[PDB]
Amino acid sequence: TLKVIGVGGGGNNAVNRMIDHGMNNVEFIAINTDGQALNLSKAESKIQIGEKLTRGLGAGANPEIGKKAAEESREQIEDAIQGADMVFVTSGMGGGTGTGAAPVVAKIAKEMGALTVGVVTRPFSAEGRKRQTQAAAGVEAMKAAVDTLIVIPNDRLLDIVDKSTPMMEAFKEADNVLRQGVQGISDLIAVSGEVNLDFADVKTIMSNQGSALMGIGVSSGENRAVEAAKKAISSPLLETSIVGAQGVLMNITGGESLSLFEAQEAADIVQDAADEDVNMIFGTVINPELQDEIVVTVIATGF
Amino acid sequence: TLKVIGVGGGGNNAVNRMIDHGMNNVEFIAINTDGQALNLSKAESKIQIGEKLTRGLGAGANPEIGKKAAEESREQIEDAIQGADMVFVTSGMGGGTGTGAAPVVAKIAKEMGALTVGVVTRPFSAEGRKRQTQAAAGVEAMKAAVDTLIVIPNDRLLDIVDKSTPMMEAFKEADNVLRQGVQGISDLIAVSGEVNLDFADVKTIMSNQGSALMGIGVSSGENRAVEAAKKAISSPLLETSIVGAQGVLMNITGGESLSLFEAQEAADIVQDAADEDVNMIFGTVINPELQDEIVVTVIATGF
Ligand SMILES: Nc1nc2c(ncn2[C@@H]2O[C@H](COP(=O)(O)OP(=O)(O)OP(=O)(O)O)[C@@H](O)[C@H]2O)c(=O)[nH]1
Ligand SMILES: Nc1nc2c(ncn2[C@@H]2O[C@H](COP(=O)(O)OP(=O)(O)OP(=O)(O)O)[C@@H](O)[C@H]2O)c(=O)[nH]1
Ligand SMILES: [Mg+2]
Ligand SMILES: [Mg+2]
């Protein structure tokens, strides 16, 4: 009676999240151009489009490919729609597959008679200008091919999460913040007994200082070192009041691939942000359970 | 070498979170007045204080009890400190146990020679005026008994989570938002086949409307009905632009205890917020996996 079709990479991930969470009496269909990513989809129906233009590879962030690739497979798409009274076209706008194919997939199911509802997201502004522009063009194309369209701008995703967070889960977040503050110091000073830092350095930093401020920044990807350091500096506690810090304690924790040059980089970032006479000591921790994300946590004292 | 002591209810929950997450080379101690809650603590060291004043019950949000209850057990507290070079006093300020005992526990370990570091949180402003005032008094007492004090105001917890959220986890949140939007409609209309709503009502609401806006609000506790409805109305998509909605679709999902009067209440809240000529239909879903929290999700159309 109801069919939900995830088109694109992020569209498939949302569908897989709809399945892992208990969802019944809905028929799932995964549409994508990445051959490998469709193998990861838990959806019953899987449709690969545009194999002649991509050879099983991704659409390559070009929405013009996504438009044609969906047109080349008009046959198979209509077959999966058959029998549906209402259809959900869930996609992430800004890419090449979802940005181009989702409007096509919508117009097919709409002209086939079903109630076509689009449920899409605008990308984060940090993803670049081109991805935002392509998304805007796709949302306009989506609006002209659906009965109703739901637009989720990722820039306002933080507040949607806040209103959808119960008070029980809120304290669980506060629990993890207290953990990150304590672990950020203990994993740096008392580190078993091969080679690490000592105590007298930490003593001078925190002995009878008084009020302290904390910042946490987690980042991954190419420029993960600069980004994680920037995120930690712009936390509400330290964005306006690290320049007066006379003592700084920094913990950088990363996966197996965490280079030592990457550690000095984030250290130099926090060091420059602090006072000129700052007394900064830092160290590095290798937690392999983190795949390739780093967690820069910094404590500031003095004032 | 390092000891972390969670004093109070929330203090124990943070310690248990420090243990479930892989944390090594630290000695955990749980201090509290709730006899049952200390049975739930995974900490190796457990200390119940003030059994004569509370008989194993909670301190009752009176910080004066927490001060004496920690003084009555000065003996056992000093025994757990012994051998520590640095001690962490993690507590939630605003209560009765943590607000009063944590300053005492800190001054004991500080005069015993260890490096005393306080890691506490201010309560949410939504928790009341008295709990904020008691926390402010306790933070002042904490500051006068520790070497350094870390203050986490829960009002700014949302931004700390944002900077500590990697881009991989950010899309996982967006995945769950798309799920909540689609599930909020499918669980309302096509509901198997005993007794529920029909299709022609949903057809008139969404046929050729165009742009739509979504709001999600999750709440639990005593006044959970009004709160969850208020949270959904003040989402970034609907807080400024539901008054012009000519059609509203509302899904209220709750646990086993979800009363039917509770459903009409939240419906009347959203109904009043919309336009006078609004065409609102709604329904109720019982998901027992939710213990006692409700999830009000609302779709708006028209404009
Ligand atoms: N909900 C959700 N959105 C995502 C996810 N990953 C990326 N996005 C968003 O979707 C936009 C486009 O990414 P994709 O959907 O993967 O692009 P695609 O069309 O599937 O991939 P290409 O065929 O190479 O163009 C990005 O700008 C992100 O904002 C995800 O895992 N979940
Ligand atoms: N980190 C964290 N903080 C919490 C948690 N629960 C409550 N809090 C905060 O702690 C403050 C006081 O709550 P509790 O710590 O439970 O008070 P308590 O002293 O342990 O309990 P009483 O002995 O009855 O006074 C509240 O205002 C909350 O803001 C939690 O689970 N984790
Ligand atoms: Mg992809
Ligand atoms: Mg308690």
Author numbering:
A (entry chain A), B (entry chain A): 13 to 315
Quote the study's own text.
Specifically, two SaFtsZ mutations, F138A and T66W, were designed to inhibit SaFtsZ filament formation on the basis of equivalent mutations inhibiting the assembly of Methanocaldococcus jannaschii FtsZ (M164A and T92W, respectively; polymerization inhibition of T92W [unpublished data]). Both mutation sites are located on the “top” surface of FtsZ, in the N-terminal GTP-binding domain, and are part of the longitudinal protofilament interface seen in crystals. For easier reference, the five SaFtsZ structures are named herein in the form #XXx: number (1 to 5), mutation (F for F138A, T for T66W), monomer conformation (O for open, C for closed), and finally the arrangement of monomers within the crystal (m for monomeric, f for filamentous, single protofilament and s for split/domain swapped). Unlike the closed-form T7 mutant SaFtsZ crystals, none of our closed crystal forms contain straight filaments running through the crystals. We know that our mutations compromise filament formation, and we obtained crystals where these mutant SaFtsZ proteins adopt the closed conformation and fail to form bona fide interfaces. Hence, we propose that these closed forms correspond to the conformation of monomeric SaFtsZ in solution. The fact that the phosphate end of the interface is not formed in any of the F138A closed-form crystals supports the idea that it is the closed conformation that is not compatible with the formation of bona fide interfaces, not the mutation per se—because the F138A mutation is within the pseudointerface.
